Design brief:
Chain lengths: ~130, ~250, ~280, ~50, ~270
RNA sequence: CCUUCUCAAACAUGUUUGGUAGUGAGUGAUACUCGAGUUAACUUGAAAUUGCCUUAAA
């Protein structure tokens, strides 16, 4: 039938995990609040899940915010069926780049790029593309 | 109750304020190291706005200057960040309608750039300084028969003579002289004086006062500008007319 | 009511038009009804002057507004400038409450009280609406009296003020009085005298008294913003090196000379010696 | 919603539905009047809007 | 730098590879220059500013003269400040750019971007229809928030900064000179955070192979003095890479005033 | 129910340098540099079901 799990979508930019928790704790006690985010960048996928201790509170929240127009977003709220525990929604951060070490010596890597150039030459000769050297 | 629109608006405005303060902090670290190869601009700008309004964007000469700083209400739906709150608390500007004197130098300019959207910054004239001190002058003084000190007006020159006389300050006129000339014991006088509690220019909620509030908000929006540009000039307004309205 | 309707409907431009197209009441006909004679108004302006000088010294609050206080200060400065230029002061008494001045305006003795430039605390126990009503009436009456006095003397009312002098020292010196021997000896005192008033001395009191008993004043406080000196008025326990050609004195010498009418000898008034008692002229 | 006599707008929802016009019943003819600079207004319409 | 005979043979082979006998007949005849750097080009910092490489031969004039039979024809967008949008009109650009055959279809401002094209669908539809977007270097810094990140995924939709101010005032002559210079002499190139950099030389029918050879030789000669490059390749879409350069020595490069102000503003 | 870095220096109107970190989801070809970083171009309503300070106050 129905569970105490709420699926929210068409979220605005500023609606995040703590904002959803602060807004829906008014409707009722929340077991868990999760937000779908991208893995490599810290940007919302504009949907998430929440879990009320009371399924009646979840139903009240759904009939309250089902078609709420918010900052140009017509919010969508659904009550999930029995079961379907929310999982695998990690609060990712913004990842950064950093240069690691290169264990290959200079002579070996120059030889490897020369062999790669030779392989390109062989590929060009096989293809019928007459490029010199 | 709290509305989701208010929550999201506060979140977005606070995030943009934090982004602005972070960019200003990065630029100030680069300027402090003062050898960075990559920088947009490496100098300090002053945008003086006077009165139909004219704005002059000049450089900062670097010589110390006298400023009056008034704490005004900040941007709407913005939670004040820790850095701005720390600077305002060190300047004793925790609440609005409160004014202090600041000796602006090269190391004072970045703090003003950080706290720009919460303060009105001006050059006080001698008459404005004298009117401010003689009208609203308060100190925290500990009486001999008093178990705990309290805040009283700057009414007695004997208290000034017994608290700052060793530094050479005997009276309210001497305090005014040191504040105006930015001389010796400027910090001592400026912290002997409590922060100046100004009154609001428009108060009340009748129809006349609400229309005056609309006009005041229009004028303030026209004058004050929020650049959010990490190299924004420090904006200087007519603090003489502002204090004439606020005192 | 109509402005409330416009604001409630959200017609802010209409509200601005309604606020601009209104006319306030005036008290000129009431002034003429209550004072059929200019001497009667002169004999009644004492309480008006006291109230105006009181309200020109208060800070702006929720009940008392900056515009009201600035108007009161402006009319008080105009009165002081007129009295100083026409040289009409006769008696001065510096009591702990304030300075009592007595000037002869059109053959009538007018006494008023001026507080010192200190931040007096508001009792928050007084009928401020009643006092502001009295202030409105007194302001209208003193506007009428000042116009008549300036026009009788042959001056322009209201006199224009100098912006730079107002931004240096907001006193009676900022109002320059334009047009189109005096009675001995109070006005004739301090003739060809230049007083260098030191920083610690109340500049408004000393300058008004000297200029009313005409002389020149050079203020040390006014020099903060950035030869002919004869006397120097100081009040300090320890005085630095003194120029041999300048007479050093204390402010009580001015008060005693003004109340005596003659030039009280200055050997009794020195920075390092006790002063004679400041006797009341009344 | 508060139009008296009600016959002035009682046909309007059905007419809008038949013509395919989007419509909404709102509370306050005084509110619609403030919208159109009148004391009251039984109806309001958005026909052409800015980009 | 690059051998003339080598690059001539490379260009002839790439133009011969396309003409062996949807978008397959349009995208497979685009000439691309690949530059491989020893380290990251910009460094650890992402860059959205396009680098302008100045060449001998025109690039957008052939684009305009070849877009007459193209579904997406050639379009130029001009971005100007709000205070400067009222000083110029389309006639003021036509009379100054008609001699060289330069036409600007649309001029917008930041207010137009923030109001008319605020919605994502309208913004994409407006941005995608232009091939050369130029912006004032004053307002160029605010454009990542205004034009969005989808507008920066392409070289042609990435804005180009120009110097429209001479002696701290907007000058129509300086604006037109910078627009003409960008149209004729220089080309835009996206500097990446990696090592592989892509340059779109254009279409095979736009210019003669001699013009392509001269342009790529000048590009190599300028880029050598610009940065210490490692490898140079020439390709067409759906084709392998033909190397044109090989060097060794550039490889061995692999192996509190804030508290002062607080003290100044604090008494204890 | 907020509203977006709208620019600087240096040399003689020109020249050089620096300043820009993005709605999400999906389709995709192709090569390059050591599970990481880049590289042609196409779709979409602001689309979506889970990758461990308080007088802007009552």
């Amino acid at each position: 039938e129905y569970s105490g799990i709420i699926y929210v979508s068409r979220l605005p930019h500023g609606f995040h995990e703590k904002e959803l928790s602060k807004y829906f704790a008014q409707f009722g006690d929340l077991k868990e609040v999760r937000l779908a985010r991208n893995k490599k960048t810290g940007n919302s996928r504009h949907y998430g899940f929440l879990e009320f201790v009371n399924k009646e509170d979840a139903m009240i929240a759904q009939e309250s915010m089902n078609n709420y127009l918010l900052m140009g977003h017509l919010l969508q709220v659904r009550v999930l069926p029995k079961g379907a525990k929310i999982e695998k929604l990690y609060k990712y951060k913004k990842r950064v780049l950093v240069e690691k070490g290169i264990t290959k010596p200079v002579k070996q890597l120059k030889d490897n790029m020369k062999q790669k150039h030779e392989e390109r030459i062989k590929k060009l000769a096989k293809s019928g593309i007459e490029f010199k050297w | 109750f709290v509305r989701a629109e208010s929550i999201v608006a506060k979140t977005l405005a606070t995030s943009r304020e934090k982004e602005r303060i972070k960019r200003v902090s990065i630029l100030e670290d680069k300027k402090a190291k003062n050898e960075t190869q990559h920088i947009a601009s490496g100098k300090d700008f002053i945008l003086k706005i006077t009165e139909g309004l004219i704005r002059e964007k000049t450089t900062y000469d670097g010589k110390p200057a006298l400023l009056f700083i008034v704490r005004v209400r900040g941007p709407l739906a913005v939670n004040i960040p820790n850095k701005a709150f720390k600077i305002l608390s060190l300047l004793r500007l925790v609440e609005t309608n409160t004014g202090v004197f600041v000796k602006l130098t090269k190391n004072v300019y970045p703090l003003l750039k950080v706290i720009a959207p919460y303060v009105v910054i001006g050059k006080p004239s001698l008459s404005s300084i004298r009117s401010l001190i003689q009208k609203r002058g308060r100190i925290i003084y500990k009486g001999e028969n008093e178990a705990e000190p309290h805040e009283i007006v700057l009414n007695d020159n004997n208290i000034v003579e017994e608290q700052l006389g060793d530094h050479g300050i005997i009276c309210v006129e001497d305090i005014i002289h040191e504040i105006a000339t930015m001389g010796e014991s400027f910090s001592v006088c400026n912290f002997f004086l409590q922060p100046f509690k100004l009154n609001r220019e428009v108060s009340g909620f009748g129809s006349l006062n609400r229309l005056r509030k609309i006009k005041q908000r229009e004028a303030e929006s026209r004058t004050r500008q929020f650049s959010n540009a990490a190299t924004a000039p420090v904006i200087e307004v007519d603090i003489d007319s502002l204090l004439a309205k606020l005192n | 009511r109509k402005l409330t309707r416009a604001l409630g409907r959200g017609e802010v431009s209409s509200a601005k038009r309604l606020e601009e197209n209104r006319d306030s009441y005036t008290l000129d006909h009431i002034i003429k009804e209550r004072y059929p004679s200019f001497p009667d108004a002169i004999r009644d302006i004492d309480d008006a002057l006291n109230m105006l000088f009181l309200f020109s010294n208060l800070p702006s609050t929720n009940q008392v507004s900056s515009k009201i206080i600035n108007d009161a200060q402006k009319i008080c400065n105009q009165w002081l400038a007129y009295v100083a230029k026409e040289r009409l002061v006769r008696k001065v008494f510096v009591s702990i409450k304030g300075v009592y001045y007595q000037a002869n305006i059109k053959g009538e003795e007018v006494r008023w009280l001026v507080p010192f430039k200190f931040p007096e605390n508001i009792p928050s126990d007084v009928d401020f609406r009643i006092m502001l009503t009295f202030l409105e009436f007194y302001s209208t009456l003193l506007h009428f009296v000042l116009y008549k006095l300036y026009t009788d003397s042959g001056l322009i009312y209201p006199p224009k003020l100098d912006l730079k002098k107002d931004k240096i020292i907001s006193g009676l010196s900022s109002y320059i009085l334009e047009s189109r021997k005096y009675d001995s000896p109070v006005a004739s005192l301090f003739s060809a005298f230049v007083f260098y008033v030191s920083r610690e001395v109340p500049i408004d009191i000393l300058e008004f008294l000297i200029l009313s008993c005409g002389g020149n004043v050079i203020s040390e406080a006014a020099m903060d913003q950035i030869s002919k000196v004869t006397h120097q008025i100081v009040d300090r326990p320890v005085l630095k090196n003194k120029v041999a050609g300048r007479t050093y004195i204390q402010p009580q010498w001015i008060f005693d000379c003004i109340n005596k009418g003659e030039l009280v000898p200055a050997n009794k008034y020195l920075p390092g010696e006790a002063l004679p008692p400041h006797l009341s002229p009344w | 919603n508060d139009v008296d006599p009600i016959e002035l707008v009682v046909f309007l929802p059905a007419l809008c539905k038949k013509m395919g016009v989007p419509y909404a019943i709102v509370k306050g003819k005084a509110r619609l009047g403030t919208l159109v600079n009148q004391k009251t207004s039984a109806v309001a319409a958005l026909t052409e809007v800015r980009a | 730098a690059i051998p003339r005979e080598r690059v001539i043979k490379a260009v002839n082979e790439l133009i011969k590879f396309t003409s062996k006998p949807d978008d397959e007949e349009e995208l497979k005849k685009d000439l691309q220059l690949i530059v491989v750097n020893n380290k990251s080009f910009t460094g650890t910092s992402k860059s959205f500013k396009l680098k302008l490489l100045n060449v001998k031969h025109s690039f957008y004039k052939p684009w305009k003269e070849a877009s007459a039979t193209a579904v997406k024809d050639f379009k130029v967008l001009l971005i100007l400040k709000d205070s400067d949008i009222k000083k110029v009109s389309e006639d003021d650009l036509f009379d100054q750019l008609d001699s060289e055959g330069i036409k600007v279809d649309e001029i917008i401002c930041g207010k137009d971007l923030k109001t008319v094209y605020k919605a994502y669908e309208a913004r994409n539809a407006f941005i995608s229809q232009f091939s050369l977007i130029l912006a004032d270097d004053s307002i160029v810094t605010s454009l990542p928030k205004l034009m969005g990140g989808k507008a920066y995924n392409k070289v042609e939709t990435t804005p180009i900064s120009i110097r429209t101010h001479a002696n701290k005032e907007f000058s129509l002559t300086t604006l037109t000179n910078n627009i003409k210079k960008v149209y004729m002499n220089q080309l835009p190139v996206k500097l990446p955070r990696g090592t592989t950099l892509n340059v779109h030389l254009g279409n095979l029918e736009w210019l003669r192979p001699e013009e392509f050879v001269d342009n790529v030789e000048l590009i190599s000669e300028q880029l050598i003095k610009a940065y210490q490059i490692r490898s140079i390749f020439i390709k067409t879409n759906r084709s392998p890479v033909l190397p044109l350069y090989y060097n060794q020595d550039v490889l061995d490069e692999l192996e509190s005033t804030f508290n002062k102000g607080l003290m100044e503003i604090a008494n204890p």
